Structure formats: C-alpha cells, structure tokens
Amino acid sequence: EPLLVVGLGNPGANYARTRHNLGFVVADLLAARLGAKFKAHKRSGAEVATGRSAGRSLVLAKPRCYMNESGRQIGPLAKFYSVAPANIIVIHDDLDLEFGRIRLKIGGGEGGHNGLRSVVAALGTKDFQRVRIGIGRPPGRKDPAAFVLENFTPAERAEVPTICEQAADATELLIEQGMEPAQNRVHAW
C-alpha cells in the first residue's frame, strides 16, 4: 500500500526555525537520508520528495501554504497517490509533551495544533499516524499560539538536531514495523 509522510510548518525563511516548523525540519532530514530533493507538486500545491526506506517506497511532503490550510494540500496529496489515512504519517510539534519527548499514535486529539485540525478536517478522520515531538507550552492556561511561532531557546537549540534525528528514526521505524513495535523502541524516556 502507498505511504505518505508529511511534515507540518509555515512557509518562509523567517519561520523555518520556529517550534511550529519541527515537522519541516524532520522532513528535510528524511529527504537528506533518502538522497531525495523536494520538487513542486502541481496537483496539490505542496512540494514532494520520493524515495525508499528499507526498500519500501514513500512520498515525503511539505505543504506550501500557511499552517492553517495544511489539509487543503494534504487531502489532495492523499487522493493523488491513493494513500489511505491509516498510511499517512504526520510529523508535528506537540504542546502537550515535554520538550524533546517523542511519542507515536494513531487517532486521538490534536493537542491544539491548528495544522492537525486542518488535516483531520480534510481527511474526514483522526485515524492517521502521528510523530509527536514535544515542545512544552506556556504555564497556566495561557494561549500557546504565539509560543509556537517563536524560535527555540539557545539551550533548546543544543538538543534540537538530536531530537530531529530521533524523530526521523521514529518515522522510519513506523514505516518498517508499525505502531506498537515502533512505540516500544521510540518512547525512550
């Protein structure tokens, strides 16, 4: 069955290192591992890189619209390559996990992620896979919408590349062995 891996993020150099763009950073790392380049995808508006991970073919994609409208490109991507939602993996920052903590699931909530809500709406289901990468959140009940548009702190920047290697590793393990075995290895702390 066809497989689609998507990173979420906002466009533009000024957003490239913000918390809300972790998905793009990991997708870029996956494409580097696969020796693949992102190219414009006319039918969806996104950009896609294609390759194989342990012999299995995959489409790697980053939307090119604002985060709010992510599903309007991911939906068409899924139809174009005939990928069922169960075989879509979305990589994203997660306000509800400690910074650097990676967790995998299918279904469940969006954790307040506006990109995830757009994808859920477009696919008509919550039942796609996710690579959740913790970023923490502001304390109390403060609105986090501005926190995710900040760059990481210097202390956090010291760990972000390692975290992205782990998230890239988690994506490949998901593709190779599925949810439960990948969870066993990936939930490392």
UniProtKB/Swiss-Prot annotation:
Keywords: Cytoplasm, Hydrolase, RNA-binding, tRNA-binding
Catalytic residue positions: H20
GO cellular component: a single term: cytoplasm
Variant or mutagenesis effect after changing G100D: Complements an E.coli ts mutation
Superkingdom of the organism of origin: Bacteria
UniProt keyword Transit peptide, yes or no: no
HAMAP family: Pept_tRNA_hydro_bact
Descriptive protein name: Peptidyl-tRNA hydrolase
Gene: pth
